[PDB]
Amino acid sequence: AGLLKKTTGLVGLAVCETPHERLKILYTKILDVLGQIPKNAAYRKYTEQITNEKLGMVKAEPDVKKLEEQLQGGQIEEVILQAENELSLARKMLRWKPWEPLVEEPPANQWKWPI
Amino acid sequence: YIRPGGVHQDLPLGLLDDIYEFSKNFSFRIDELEEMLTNNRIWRNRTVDIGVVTAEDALNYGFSGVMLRGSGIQWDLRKTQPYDVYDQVEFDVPIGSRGDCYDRYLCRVEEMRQSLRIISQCLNKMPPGEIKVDDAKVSPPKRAEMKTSMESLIHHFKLYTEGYQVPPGATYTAIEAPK
Amino acid sequence: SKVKQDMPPPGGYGPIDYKRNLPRRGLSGYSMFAVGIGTLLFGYW
Amino acid sequence: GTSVKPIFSRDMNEAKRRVRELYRAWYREVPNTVHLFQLDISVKQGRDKVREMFMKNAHVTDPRVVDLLVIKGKMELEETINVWKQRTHIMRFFHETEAPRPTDFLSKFYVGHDP
Amino acid sequence: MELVQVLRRGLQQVSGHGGLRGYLRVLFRANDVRVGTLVGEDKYGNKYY
Amino acid sequence: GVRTSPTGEKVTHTGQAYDDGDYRRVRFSDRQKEVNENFAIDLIAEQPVSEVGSRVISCDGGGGALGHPRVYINLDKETKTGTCGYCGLQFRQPHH
Amino acid sequence: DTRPTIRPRNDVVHKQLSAFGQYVAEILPKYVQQVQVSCFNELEIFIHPDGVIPVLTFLRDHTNAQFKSLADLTAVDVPTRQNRFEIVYNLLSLRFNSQIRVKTYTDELTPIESSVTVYKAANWYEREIWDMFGVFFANHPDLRRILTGYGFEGHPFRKDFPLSGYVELRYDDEVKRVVAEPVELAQEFRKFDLNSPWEAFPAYRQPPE
Amino acid sequence: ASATRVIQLLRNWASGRDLQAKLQLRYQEISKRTQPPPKLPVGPSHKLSNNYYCTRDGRREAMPPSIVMSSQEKKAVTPAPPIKRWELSKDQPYL
Amino acid sequence: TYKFVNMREPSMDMKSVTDRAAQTLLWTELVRGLGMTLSYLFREPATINYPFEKGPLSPRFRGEHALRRYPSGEERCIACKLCEAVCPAQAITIEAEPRADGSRRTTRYDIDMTKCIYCGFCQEACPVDAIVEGPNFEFSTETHEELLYNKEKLLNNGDKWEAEIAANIQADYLYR
Ligand code: SF4
Ligand code: SF4
């Protein structure tokens, strides 16, 4: 927390003055959209694993300065940007649905370099 | 000069001395440029706040090197993925914080000075030893050994006509070329 | 014979300056305006 | 094996549909191209030539090959009207600098030992 | 005093280049009026300094 | 040495010689045909035949590192003075 | 290294990449046909042709991948494969300092929907893959020629295309314009057959076929 | 070098620095162009003791890529540990 | 490690802004450019008087090629045929024959100066160090044919620059 840092050092990415609760409401949202994808899905299990866990201390620890090393992912102002990206993925692979087997096995030995 | 397996030849005797003399005087020449351009209004107004890009677009556009570091992106190949002996040397990557034309210019001139740091360190810590690998199958044998030893002659013959056969596979290697 | 090849001096080469050595010279801003005004009233007088 | 992806066209009908307006466009462009590019050839020569390259490939059956070559043939008409090509780039299609190559069997036999 | 020596060196250039003729010769043939010690000579007339 | 052709046309060590017509010779007039007056064959033939009394003689060719790859030519054929392939120097041995 | 001649290997990265290789594999059992981690700590994700958007969007925005740096896109024309072309993406992660390689097989006619939406860097990096190789990219802003000459014919990087090509230019005084003619060389390419008849390294040998 | 002192003050004062300390061109400081012959070292594996190529086979020790999953409770991992925020410059952090 | 290059904190005291106003009004920084460039006006130039003096080179220099020969006089080249094999521009074209003596050398060593790259691979190619690049670089010409060299032309150049290159490889073969 502390004094609002003037710039993030990355032009284009600004400083959000209320970062902790924005990260909160994002993390619930991806948990919310993750409700649609059935339980057996591996992507759901992976991100239901790192969402609530990473939602843990952001709910508990309110100091964004300590939140830097809680997530070890750089500045919070782009962590929420990354959280948005994860939300975009949840929307995207809700169409992709890759849990079916391969569309096609690779035609004969198209792999197996060298020829 | 830079061949697979090291370098083709060794430096002429005393070459480290002359480049050391150049290194001492070169920092003055960098000061010469900064005096000439850095504080000049005309240069700044033709350069400052010009061609600015955000960090995300710069990274998504596939940019690299100064194009990212000028926009504040914290990345450099020599530091993040140190190839060759770049790990055993320290240097200050000149990260800007505007992304416009001016930030990259100051980023470059500092990279000039930080390059001069590398010359100084490698000069005081130049190790002895051979210039190429000790494997004739990929490194041509020494000329003296060429004209006295059969296996040198065969390996030299096959290396300069057929060449070393590289095992199959694929590899995209990456270095931070000043571009 | 012993291995002779291009090697640095045993103590190493001398330190190489790399800072920016831009010279802090010139007069104070007030002095610039003071003399700038100073030569003026001489001219009008 | 037979089943395949229609890069733009299901059937040769819509493939032949695609060639039509591009043929219409290529016939409309001839008077202006010769005008601004400053040539010496006649408008009809462009028309009967634009005729020419439409025919030597007018024998395919796969609707992918025709329509992929449609976007290929698409890819010069705009390259002309925006004066991107040079004069040498469209007199190249008017191959004129060469001697007329031999057609009868005797003429090839006379020139050299090469079918 | 320093400017006097430099002018003295300038006149020494004319004396070194065989008086006036050689000084004018090298200036209009080589654009150089600086004189150095003789170092060698091939079998061609190519004066080396 | 060097010889002279019927058209003058100083022959080379290889033996190239343009014929009477040989229209390609038109490039030669108003210019000069570069000929290396030193011919390899007859500047090694007159060289003295070395006399070394051994069966096997190294043939580095002077300055072993700077010469040619050292060979171990045999010296037993009394009919023919054994010579290095690279050097061309004819090493003969006195009366075995 | 006890043997300084040979290059030391990094096993720690090797299974860590292998762990991430299985990771992405389990998310998309529909797309990820093959995952391979080579000896030099390089991981390769073999995907289906229609996976250009999904897996790349996955690698770009994932929490555990964040591969947003499009290094390059290249084709590998292999005649002996029924899919001659092999489009190869290279991805780089700023956060995990790692590299990602994904390859898609493709024929001449079969198109690949453009990855411009995923990475806008690919905008220019398709205008030459269409030029050099001839693989067409669907729903792409522009496919213009930027390497081959204006109106040049063919796809030079194809291995059925000669190194000398077919057309050679020369300024012609008859027409006051440089014009193209069939190529005839001053000297032909003296090809060299350097493949030794004795077998190389036996590790990568093909099985008895 | 040639240059008289009064010129040197003019150059030094105009540029704001002393230049006779280091100059753009060269002088007697360079190494002479007839350096003594060198005695380049030998290879690390140049020994005529045990040196079998069966040990060093860099080209031959290469292995085709390891098969891990082929078409024919879980943890969450990353391809590498996330990067570490490097600290500012110790010599000069703010230029 | 890293450092910032544009973080400027202009102190807003009455002092510094006066300097900033002085900078803009009286072109102090521009005057530095004048005084800066004036400084080198009064300095000597480093303009070599070509061709009365050339640039500094090194014994390893690569220039116009010249086939050499042994102290006896016999040519070094032995139809080794390695030179064109390693030459990455295929400028070398060499064909050998039987010779009358049996030291069967070549009839042709045409290297196209408009094809070669002055790679340096030539001397590293033939073990008898037959073809080397002489230190000459002024072998310019006006017709493209003269740049096309031939076995006679190289061997003539070898006999010309023999005094130079022999000493060059004399002082450099230890490195090689
Ligand atoms: S010049 Fe050298 S490489 Fe070429 S044929 Fe002669 S010996 Fe062999
Ligand atoms: S001249 Fe250069 S390019 Fe030509 S063969 Fe020699 S090294 Fe190769």
Ligand SMILES: [Zn+2]
């Ligand atoms: Zn010999």
